[PDB]
Symmetry: D2
Subunit: 296 residues, 4 copies
């Protein structure tokens, strides 16, 4: 009983190294037979491509079969910008941007349309919170709005823009986090607020795209992973040790584990699953208390 994506195509918005979930989601979708089209945040695109081409990620490219993952094509992208009339002269002038073009979501989707004409799977695997290090109390309107835009509306734009080239029976998946639903000290700047909306949008978009084009929409609320961004937030390591001590099952969490879950959810086996928020966290979220409390 395979998770079969053979003949399917996927657009993965959010890889820039072999260190996060997106890469992992990509091996899984690759491993299932899907054709990978990666969405790379412009700034990182150059180095990613270079590293990729020269082989920095070769081991990371080894599929379950021993074969290596192939990345069909890499498109530069910035999910905060929907169309060319939207970018600011400052943003355009802003260096890296000079080097690749057609990187707004609308443009990206267009290149893809022209390039392969359609996709089946759409994978959101990005976000950003300029003030993540601040408590909601110390978080500015702009910062808050930035987070919501980058981490939340970014999914709405991509889906909306790609939907027209998504083959019926296709699906999308995103990566959320428990902070949307529970208080997680340290995840500030409106990032919490952002997942909440991302998750809410999943249910809404599920209805809309489901009815519009029989496309499924879900999201995976993932456990902590020392990705690049995570390490940037700076609390992930403790979070990894927290999850290790206190989860129903005690073990490591691996990118791998979120990847397969995503591959499943975007496959035909998951045909009756839509509007979901699946927790791939070793059950952590289901705990009523932490085992490690000094009181115990």
């Amino acid at each position: 009983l395979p998770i079969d994506l053979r003949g399917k195509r996927a657009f993965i918005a959010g890889i820039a190294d072999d260190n996060g979930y997106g890469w992992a989601v990509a091996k899984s979708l690759a491993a299932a037979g899907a054709e990978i089209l990666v969405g790379t945040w412009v700034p990182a695109l150059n180095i990613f491509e270079t590293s990729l081409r020269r082989g920095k990620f070769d081991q990371s490219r080894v599929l379950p079969d021993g074969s290596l993952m192939e990345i069909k094509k890499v498109y530069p992208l910035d999910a905060v910008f929907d169309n060319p009339e939207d970018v600011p002269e400052d943003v355009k002038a802003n260096k890296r941007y000079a080097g690749s073009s057609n990187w707004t979501v609308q443009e990206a989707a267009e290149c893809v349309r022209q390039d392969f004409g359609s996709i089946d799977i759409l994978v959101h695997s990005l976000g950003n919170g300029p003030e993540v290090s601040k408590p909601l109390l110390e978080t500015s309107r702009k910062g808050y709005l930035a987070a919501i835009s980058a981490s939340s509306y970014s999914f709405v734009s991509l889906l909306s823009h790609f939907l027209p080239i998504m083959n019926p029976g296709g699906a999308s998946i995103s990566l959320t986090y428990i902070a949307s639903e529970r208080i997680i000290p340290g995840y500030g700047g409106g990032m919490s607020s952002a997942k909440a909306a991302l998750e809410s949008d999943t249910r809404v978009l599920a209805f809309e795209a489901g009815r519009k084009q029989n496309i499924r929409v879900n999201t995976i609320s993932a456990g902590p992973l020392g990705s690049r961004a995570a390490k940037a937030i700076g609390f992930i390591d403790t979070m990894i040790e927290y999850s290790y001590n206190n989860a129903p099952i005690q073990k490591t969490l691996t990118a791998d584990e979120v990847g397969n879950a995503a591959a499943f959810l975007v496959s035909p086996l998951a045909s009756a699953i839509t509007g979901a928020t699946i927790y791939v966290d070793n059950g952590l979220n289901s705990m009523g208390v932490a085992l490690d409390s000094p009181v115990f």
Copy 2:
């Protein structure tokens, strides 16, 4: 057993008339014996005051004890703007906005401080969505963000600002809606996303303000009430009628009922209640199927 607010001051950002929830809360709080400060949205400000001069809501100010409400002072207010330094000379140029001043949330709170040195209760009963009529799929990033800015971040701003002059042991209340957690056709423009964020932040702010100033923070997920804003949305009547048909108890919903839950939630009686999302909707949210579906 009284809900006792005597000697308590409350600042209710969110009245513009006597047709919506905010008025009801003022009332209940007035009834609870709290002193009423109000923050009307600048545009509506003049008319509101004017209307509340000619005795347009005289019948509407009568309390349970045939006593009359007494709104201490009305403040001009725009929750999208946190400080003067943030205003668009465009808005500033606007007549209403010219006709008033000190309306930024940072400005609004300083006045209360000077005028009254303090408060104990903050009520948020506003929000705006330029695109409520559009599906997430048809919703602009500008609109989504506007919706999240006026509807979610404004709470953050108000609380963050006023919190300094909140008396430890004080508390806050806001009004959310089910579309945040469940799919509700017609409630668009990212408003649903906005509620999700407003709800997520209640929890996080309960932690933040809870630990910083011993202030409580909750939100009430209210049922449909044909208010002025609900009027605009253009789907409430159906929802109202819908709720009549399909809730556990088949009855009406009156702001009055939302208004009492707020007074309670903001009173000492509710002291071990914080970071909650109390549904005051006649239990509709618990239903697993509409009773009025034709299959039945």
Copy 3:
């Protein structure tokens, strides 16, 4: 704005000392003007009455007003037994039982009917788990079933039996616990399973009684309190310290705080609240992690 129960009557199933929530729920309902009819588990009835009459609970009887709570009448009861044909000869012979009679739920309700003809409020505040000290894995079918019967169906019987004498506009409330919804190590024997069902039944009964007789049904998921039963489970003290360290607001939880919440929920102010599970726990449940983890 008072919580007014004047002219109302309440039946409280579950007091045997002034140490738990039921007593607290009783002062609140008393304080609001309701007439108290207590339901005491037979075995404890004798001593409770004795202590009560002689004045062991006099201070505990002091209402907010300085006046003392009055307990209209005490009925003996055993909520595992619905009618006389249900008690086992062993149970009947079982000592304490000899001393009071008419103690099955059906009989109890009858005495009440005959005694006062109707009630408005119904308060469940009991349960029992013979194997609470055992993990679900080490818990026998009987033990599990016992817990469910005593702690869960006990509410269904009482409500069902009392409903016919409940005045329309009346309500009921019960006390649940987070273990139903999240993993709480130490609360075994199927007690976890029991709250889950108690909470589920609240939603169901809310629909049934709501539609049948316009009666409201809710439950309060309470924080830890060193009641007698709690101390019996043996983990409550650590739980109290856990809740103190890790809640959004740091403070003590007091019987008092659950009492007022219950008084509110059973009052007319709560007319649009039914099918609810309200958390009177200092926000504990909303936390995504424990602050006290050694990792932090």
Copy 4:
């Protein structure tokens, strides 16, 4: 990307024919390459075997790879009874029950042990409610408990028993229903209470078995499928039709779809997923109003 169960043994308590979910799971698991042990409820046992001798489900045993399922061994089983010492001589006297033996869960598991020394996967796909047709208000304590015993505790028993011969790294799956969390008219006899308990225990057992034997435990909240038991309930068709009308995606639901989610959830792919309640219902549970309501 395969859902690989080769070399894995699975014990599926819950088949009595090819019309329900349990069969589907066996299939998917069969397909996944796992060896199929089955536990038919003694009454249905003879007929099931008989039916599965004459090739009554021959078409129904065909796998995705045109391969045929192959049920290693069928075990007679009654999940209300955990050991022989517990049987009512009344039941024992029963012909079917005479005609078979070793059917108590403790007995059933020892045979598997002897016969196969081990397992890796446990599927629970049964339950019974003598009173499903009665509202909680009309539901007997005997019926409620029977419902909870056959439907909730049986899982506890199976797991608890088999867990000793489960290979660390194994996992369990069960089938629950939305009535546990939401009000669903027609689903009575305390069945709803039973699901709530079954769901609550998944979490707790994920902790227990998770920490004790590194076994995972999840439940799938399935949508309506016109199975034999659903047939009896006498409300599925409506629910089925209802789900067609009001889910995010308007389509059918086939055991097949529940069956695949189980295979995944029990396969290594789902290794960081435990204590979950995955809704495989075409996203209906996320809807906030029935689209088919006449108000609309």
